[model samples]
Target chain A: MNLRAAGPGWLFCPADAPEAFAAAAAAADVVILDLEDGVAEAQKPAARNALRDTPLDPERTVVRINAGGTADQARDLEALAGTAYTTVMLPKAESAAQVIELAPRDVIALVETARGAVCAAEIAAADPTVGMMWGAEDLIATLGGSSSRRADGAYRDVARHVRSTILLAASAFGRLALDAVHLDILDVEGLQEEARDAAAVGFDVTVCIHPSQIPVVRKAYAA
Target chain B: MNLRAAGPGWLFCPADAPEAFAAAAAAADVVILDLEDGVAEAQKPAARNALRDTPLDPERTVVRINAGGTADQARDLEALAGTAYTTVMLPKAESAAQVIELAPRDVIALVETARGAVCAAEIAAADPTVGMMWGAEDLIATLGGSSSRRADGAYRDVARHVRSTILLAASAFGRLALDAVHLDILDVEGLQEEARDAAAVGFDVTVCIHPSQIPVVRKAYAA
Candidate 1:
């Protein structure tokens, strides 16, 4: 139940990548097995099966399910029934009602869309079971835009406010807030700068898609 | 009072600069005579006098007042009572109630701080008289951070979210949302890229601090 106690470096591994999952879990404070966007639709069943099959430490591991109002999400939740995973990330979360309805355990409501962004405070306040929040790539995709990062690799101005809103909402509601993944795996400097900014803005954790980003994020959060 | 009818390129002139006000009015879609951050604290009295003494087309002009709870803002509101300027800009606006208090005509609620970013939707919804929303430099300063733009001149991730929140709030409330000024007067390329991003995100307009930036802002917004 104390998901955030795993600390500021949360690493994500593809649920299908069993080998990578081990490394991700070993390398970071917390590991997320992504069943939503990280898994191809064709591979979703396999990913879902892996959630039950994988020998993940329930205390330190979390699963990201598909968003509400989708057949995939319904299936994802159905598969979570009696599973050992104690923490779940709700992708494209738009409301507290959705979180309350879909949550299997402690839920991290990922506010990505414009509607989601506007209702973040309410969503955070919606349920005591909601433990954390994150938004970035899904938001850029939701906005029908290119990379959230500008050509120079900094986040576009619009993304800053979105991050701040979630932080404020999460802080107000006593929920942890995670910074979004750094998409460019090679940009360690970019990752460092972003992690610094995230820590400066008081995000509880920084999520990393790459193992290389772990040390940088850990160091930034520590600093 | 239909402040957004003035088009997309909003230019700003420091109230302390009496000579620049006329040119600013003529060159941009909307001109803002700023008595807030644009003028030094020592020159606030002179700027207030200039706001009344300066001859400019009322239809094209807006005034940016100091933030709420400041001595300057109190005087700014008192001076605005009999003024012809029909639009006012409220800096560091953290609530809708604040906008309703200082507004003489239409108001642009400038979302600048962490608190402001969190309350943007409510601020936009606070009044029917809100014409627009804007932020960037002030927000960066409020966050106690470095430049909003990165080395290649794009907003940092946190800043991007702030801009998008205001854009979403403004769009939801039927108000225009302006991208903040590009303070680097020499960087037109940077201005255009940022403006393109602003337009892509559905901001109704962009603000400029210099006459030289007018053509670039107009052209980028036009395209």
Candidate 2:
């Protein structure tokens, strides 16, 4: 699949909120049905049920599973098996082996921790890997830091480094590179700057948290 | 070798300038005798002869060699063989095999390009590798860019990313992490800020181009 040809704006829709899936799919070029951090633990079972019951266009969608070796992932897969989704977003991907284990499905390995950041190249080289993504909050958390950005709103040095690392690895291994979503929903200018830079640096997509951010991303990628 | 136990200051001295060795050795905790970019191509033969003629403490000295597979590297190794230098800095190191080939001598792989940054973890894991360093100037050159930093003097995103990539790989594989040198010789405040952040983020050394920059680095690491 020429996944990158799909577009530059990918939006995340919470799995338990099946009602929001249609809107998210319509708003973004690609829709990520989040089953991991986006869904509360209490809602995961229902999320799994919603995942099985509500199906979006499989080609335009991906399921964000729990990390490899987690009980949540095993359940995620079993529920995912009932769906037509051919792609998976493996959060906290720390090894090529983790991506390899998810074979036959195109995987977007989200490197969001110290170990994952260190293993970015290997993860990109995995047979199942079609793309690479990273998370600022999760990475800083693993480093025992409280914030991923400085007071000035730019990513801290470490976070910025990981962002570049993922981009380099993904490009080197012929995988699509996805920039992390800007989480501050009200900060349109911040998202614009981040997405413009991401597009300029050759990222295939900028995953977004809000629909309002899509037009900004699409336009920046064109520029 | 408890390489990190050595103080944080590392200064690069051109191999051809054996006259400056003593002062460089005295000013920094470690001296890197550069046979690569520091010495002009025409002066390389004289540099090699001088490298053999002047020997510093092996424990505190490392000889920088040309990139692997280069004729200059073969000559560098030949001259270096007649000396007591146990550690060699492999500039433009892009693969584990490049580091591995220098068996028995410790290698501080200098990753300074797209391919080198992509293979950082593997390069760090090589048996001969004792540390990892990165060069912003060389990296930007390799990437077909004219600058490694912004007009404000901060590293551009790509360069900063490569710096962090080398650091993470070195740390993950139990090797010393060396921050890139601050080239602006008179920019003491800039060097201080860069070194302080490098020290805080776990870099074992911050390389310097001029003797005057050593104290700023030493003082920053102390803080």
Candidate 3:
């Protein structure tokens, strides 16, 4: 599917927030119903149930599932089977085998670990992988580090390295490249700078957590 | 070959500069005798002759040949056949095949084209590749862009993307990561900033054009 045809803006809404799904889809080009970190572990069951219960337009919707080989992922997939959403965002995707395991479903591999960062090209080349994305904090912790960004709020070197690595790998394999979220929701200036760079360098999407950052991303991508 | 065992400062000297060969080796961690863009097209024969007549410590010297498939590259290889140098930097390296063709001599693949940037992982993984490096002006020009940096002296989006892409690809394949040269030879502050970032991110070398930039790189890497 031509995911970028819709737009460059994507908003992540907690899977349990069924009441906000419609609003999320209305605001951003794509609505990502996050079933992993967005929802507390205890809230996952309700979130999964809400997937089959409250559905947004499948064409404009994606479900963010737990990482592979986790019990949470098995449950998430079982819940996805009952929903109309066709695309799944697999977090912490470390290998092509993990992407392959997603099977008939289209996948967006979120590379957020050292192994995942290194295997990005293979992950992007997987048959089911339609997009490639990266996360900051999780990757830093996995790399035995403490911070993803420096005191200036700019990403530290390894984080910057992973961002570009995923972009090149995705571009090499014809997969969509999504920029990681601008974690500081209030820092629209920072968000604008990043989204502008992402757009300039051909990133297909700039995923954000807060709806306030959506218009900025749209404007940045427009330029 | 533990190319990094020497140090992080690498200075590029034109192959024809036999008088500077000894000085370059003493000034930087590794001396790169450039047979490509560093020398004028008309002086290639003289540069090749100089390489045979003058040699540095082979263990700490790398010969940078012309891009693959060019007549100059064939002539450069012919010249190299007479030298004791064990490593060559392949400029504008675009594929695994180009790197593989340099087998028996270890390679520092300088990815300076859009195709080379996209194929970075494979180029880094090539059997003969010992390190990965990138170039700013060449890459921007090849991408049909006018400038590699903005007025602020910071690299534009695609150049920054390539810098990090080369780093991750090199890290992935267990190859040394070399930073692009700071072409603004007088911009020592810029060189220090870039070199510091490179060292912070685990880069093995920060290649430079002038001896003046060597100590700056050395100190940056030391921190």
Candidate 4:
């Protein structure tokens, strides 16, 4: 958040297409040339083939494959590493054990649960390849009931605890801690405020859901 | 993310219709009965008046007026505060100072900048009525670049940072931290994953852009 940056884009793509790379190359700041959620479960190979030879600007590209311990994720890494993608974003990283599973690949570990938050530092410290992050919405889903606090400052406090933990983790091991998305777009101002809060807490980057939200994120860092 | 929630809602109605409130009530949660962004500047008054007589539910309603420091924002707040609006979400809160200026009321402090993040805690702590939130796309625009994180786990770290601070603001002093929206309804699995993440991190609720998303969000939060 200290940096004037926008997005770690969540692209909705046709993952199996040979031509999908063009759209990512054109539209994304960090092209998460995806092979998991976007591809048909059976089309993993085609997605890999599509990614095998596509050219990418190193600065703008990252590959988001499935989680480690999966055939798809392994295949994605095998197909994409040392090519267009220098970073691998490991989704659903449940613990340090999962981070260890993807060691040596420059990775961004997504902390998707309370367990993940508790283990963020260990994951960050497990290897230099990991970039630590927290998933706010996912945790809420896991709660499966109304939180003691509503969505405003109450939730913000929980988020802060995780971030501070991640910050400690990152600082302890010299790793990076990224921020989650600000899902509100009509309230662009609100998004900026949220991003500003993140920056204050020491996060340098954030994931984004909308193009409109980009400006707000950067402005929060700038101001 | 697991649970899907809501953001600033977009409930539109033509000017001069006494049914505008009822119209908004029929479809929206946190109805953005607008006096600012959605309405043409010249049509502001009609939109403002529509809410006065409209029997909309006030609990989940937010009057999205122009940001504070503007005549429109002040006028909108002045008119609605005495009525039923418990929350007034400003559209583009660029700094903590702007939020502080509008702090006395139940202000959903909308932001879209790094500076705002830098200042979120100050603003959240500045007054009892401040509720902080942000939009992702606008921050991207403000940053003048697309995301570098590519939406997997990149900028999400920054988001975790903000959510944490906002949470502290609330927990320490009892404020609100509304999460942003989920834009890509087509990516159902991704949406679910993200919703879960937000909820886990303590985002009380999130906004859905489409009606379909409402059901999806509800399902995500279901045990």
Individual DockQ of the candidates?
A: 0.18, 0.15, 0.12, 0.07
Instruction: Score candidate 4 by DockQ.
Output: 0.07
| Cα shift from native, residue A202, model 4 (Å) | 16
> lDDT of each structure?
0.79, 0.90, 0.90, 0.60
Q: Candidate 2 lDDT, tens digit per residue, A40-72?
A: 999999999999998899889999999999999
Model 4: residues with Cα > 4 Å off, grouped in runs = A1-223, B1-20, B23-29, B94-96, B147-172, B185-189
Model 1: residues >4 Å from true position, as ranges? A128-130, B1-165, B171-194, B200-223
Candidate numbers, best TM-score first, in rank order: 3, 2, 1, 4
State which candidate, 2 or 3, has the greater TM-score.
Answer: 3
Pairs of residues at least 3 apart in sequence or in different chains that clash in candidate 2: none
Candidate with maximal TM-score: 3
iRMS of candidate 4, Å: 8.7
Model 3 chain A, poorest ten-residue lDDT window?
Answer: A139-148
What local lDDT does model 3 show for residue B202?
63
lDDT (tens digit, per residue) of candidate 1 on B1-223? 4555677788888988898887788898888889997899999888888887775777877888998898899898777766787778888889878887864457788888889888888888776346556577778887899787788766787777677777767765667778788888888888888777776566767888888898888777674
Q: Flag the better candidate by DockQ, 1 or 3.
A: 1
Write model 4 residue lDDT over A79-133, tens digit each, in one string: 8763755677777666677766665657777765555654566677777344676
Ranking, lDDT, top scorer first: 2, 3, 1, 4
Candidates 1 and 2, the one with greater lDDT: 2
**Per-residue lDDT of candidate 4, residues B1-223 (tens digit):** 1112343233333334565456455665555566765578887887677767674666666666787578887778767765776666667665656765664556666665666666665666555344666666666666676762465634555554554554444333335556666556686776676566555544555555555555555555554
Error (Å) of candidate 4 at residue B61 is 1.7
> Could you give candidate 2's per-residue lDDT for residues B68-137 as a string of tens digits?
9999999999998899888999999999999999998999999999999989989999999999999999
What TM-score does each of the candidates earn? 0.61, 0.62, 0.65, 0.46
